[PDB]
């Protein structure tokens, strides 16, 4: 099938397991991804990047389009869901989703309140791909294939500042990330 995505230990990513998503570029490239809030629309929570490269953020879990495939592979539509350790600030879902166009900034933001499964027109905004980013990590790509007769955006995901926070949005140059096992996943390779 398609080539598996690898984590920072060299292990193939497993669907249903927790991974931190951490910038492959540290320093001013920042740390990991997490749920954030906008003052003007506190729910759903938005996707933000921690500024500290020592802060891995909140892990995500990946859900394959083909639920029978245990491995997360490049160029395959999947759903992405934050699994917060903390209490719920919002009752919307923590599944990533592309927002409606933001006229005040010109951006298509990554936000949450996405849906898991049910591939097709209704869930089009909830399907992401992971692609290789040259020789350094992986980039997220919004280019869903789940609806043949749907017109869709087809763009890499970059990072962009907004209102003092680092957000993710569609762009020309995708930002590179690596995947680090969370503690729950480390248990899956040890007896």
Please enumerate, by residue number, every residue annotated as part of a binding site for Zn(2+): 3, 11-12, 40, 99, 102, 104, 113, 162-163
Is residue 102 part of the contact set for Zn ion (CB under 5 A)?
Answer: yes
Please pick, from the candidates 55, 71, 131, 152, the single residue that binds Zn ion as defined by CB under 5 A.
55
* Residue that the structure tokens 């506190």 belong to: 42
Please pick, from the candidates 17, 45, 77, 99, the single residue that binds Zn ion as defined by CB under 5 A.
99
Per-position x/- string for 135-164, each x denoting binding to Zn ion as judged by CB under 5 A, each - no binding: ----------------------------x-
Please pick, from the candidates 27, 28, 68, 190, the single residue that binds Zn ion as defined by CB under 5 A.
68
Which of 91, 102, 150 is closest to 126 using CA atoms? 150
Residues 6+ apart with CB under 8 A from 127: 65, 77, 78, 79, 119, 142, 144, 145, 146
- Give contact residues for Zn ion (rule: CB under 5 A): 2, 10, 12, 55, 66, 68, 99, 102, 104, 163, 188
């Amino acid at each position: 099938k398609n080539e598996p995505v690898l984590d920072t230990d060299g292990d193939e990513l497993r669907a249903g397991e927790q991974y931190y998503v951490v910038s492959a570029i540290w320093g001013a490239g920042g740390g990991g991804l997490a749920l954030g809030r906008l003052t003007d629309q506190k729910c759903p929570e938005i996707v933000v990047q921690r500024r500290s490269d020592m802060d891995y953020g909140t892990p995500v879990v990946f859900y394959n389009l083909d639920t029978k495939d245990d491995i997360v592979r490049r160029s395959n539509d999947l759903n992405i869901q934050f699994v917060p350790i903390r209490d719920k600030l919002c009752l919307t879902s923590t599944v990533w989703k592309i927002d409606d166009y933001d006229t005040s900034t010109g951006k298509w933001w990554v936000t949450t309140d996405g849906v898991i499964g049910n591939p097709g027109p209704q869930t089009l905004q909830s399907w992401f791909k992971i692609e290789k980013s040259g020789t350094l990590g992986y980039k997220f790509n919004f280019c869903p294939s789940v609806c043949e007769s749907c017109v869709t955006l087809c763009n890499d995901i970059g990072r962009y500042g907004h209102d003092g926070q680092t957000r993710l949005a569609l762009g020309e140059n995708g930002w590179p990330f690596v995947f680090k096992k969370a503690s729950s996943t480390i248990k899956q390779v040890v007896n």
